[PDB]
Amino acid sequence: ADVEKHLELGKKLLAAGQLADALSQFHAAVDGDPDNYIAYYRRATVFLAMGKSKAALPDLTKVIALKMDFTAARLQRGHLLLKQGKLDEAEDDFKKVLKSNPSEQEEKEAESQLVKADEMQRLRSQALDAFDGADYTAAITFLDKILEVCVWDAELRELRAECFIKEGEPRKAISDLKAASKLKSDNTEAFYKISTLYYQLGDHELSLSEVRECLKLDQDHKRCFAHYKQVKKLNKLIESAEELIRDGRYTDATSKYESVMKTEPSVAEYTVRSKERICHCFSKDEKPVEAIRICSEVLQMEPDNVNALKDRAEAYLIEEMYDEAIQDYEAAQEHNENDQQIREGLEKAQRLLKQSQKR
């Protein structure tokens, strides 16, 4: 009777669009009578209207537990399961809807959802099959299709991410893993994986804070911890080096980047990036011979590295090799038409050249 009054009010409030207030009434009704099946149903239609399926599901399955013939609630759960990619359980729900005297509308909705589930069910086999056969591009194709419908399927999301890492597309993989993490709570393994991918990418900082998220969920995570110790060190070293170059302490910065390559010799990006900064160090410390040797090395690997070009240029000028200095500025300027810093140096190199040419 208090329950009934709460139920009635909630219906009015729901009809009027006052969702939170409707929710409150249906909560009160459920609390007033924990066995009443419609109370849980009413509350679930409110969560559904808000679009909070995480909250709706337990109430939907409660209703079904209490009232197995309650076709409307089972139809709704079937929808959520299909979206979650729980294909077997979805089909099971839709199929049982068909056999519990559905209204005409419910019958059409369930038949429509059984056609689609069966498509997904077929596509899932093709996706898993292509993956087991190490055909990662075929797999993505199928997963693309599946994930359009099964949008809250965390594991197929992660499987597509695996495809992307294998396909040499780590940034795409990070993105799928991030999306997946928003759908699942147990995220430790995904956070670990993204932190790793950042690491291999050279993004030491994001790698570090990403591994911190892992340790925040589980402090004892052995793999996450072992990697934390590695990035933490590798990251402090780079932070120290950049701090040293800020204060003009070039030989200590060189020394610092030397140990940066020591502590991570496998991942190419850390030597290449370290060499670039060392190239910068020798240049700014006005030590031209060494500057041109290693700025050249960097440039062997990265012919378009603007910083290396500018720094080698600056080193050529000490050596009074004006022709080589301008040629390096021109290469840098080629893709950086508007960069004021390149212009200044090129025009400087040209003034110095003229000076020497005066008679």
Experimental method: X-ray
CA distance 96 to 111: 11
Residue ranges covered by each domain of the chain = 1-359
Structure tokens at 204: 């030491």
CB neighbourhood size of 338 (10 A): 7
Q: Cα–Cα distance between 26 and 40 in angstroms, integer?
A: 8
Q: Is residue 262 exposed (0-12), middle (13-18) or buried (19+ Cβ within 10 Å)?
A: exposed
Q: Are 285 and 316 in contact (CB under 8 A)?
A: no
Measured between alpha carbons, how far is 257 from 266 in angstroms, rounded to an integer? 15
User: Per residue in 236-248, is it b (16+ CB within 10 Å) or e — as a string?
Assistant: ebbebbeebbeee
Residues in the chain: 359
Residue 209 carries which side chain, given as an amino acid letter?
Answer: S
State the Cα–Cα distance between residues 91 and 109, nearest whole angstrom.
12
Residue with tokens 């589930």: 117
The domain 1-359 having CATH identifier 2.40.70.10: the answer here is no
Single out the residue of 147, 152, 23, 148 nearest to residue 80, CA to CA. Answer: 152
Dist. CA 126–CA 139, nearest whole Å: 7
Give yes or no for a contact between 7 and 25, defined as CB atoms under 8 angstroms apart: yes
Residues 6+ apart with CB under 8 A from 155: 85
Q: Which residues of 203-225 are buried (b: 16+ CB within 10 A; e: fewer)?
A: bbebbbebbebbbeebeebeebe
| The two three-digit tokens of residue 46, written as one number | 């409110």
Query: 336 to each of 304, 342, 345, how far by Cα in Å?
Result: 11, 8, 13
Tokens (6 digits) for 157: 């999301």
Q: Which of 82, 213, 195 is nearest to 147 (CA)?
A: 82
Token pair, residue 117, equals 């589930």
CA–CA separation, 90 and 108 (whole Å): 15
Give resolution in angstroms: 2.5
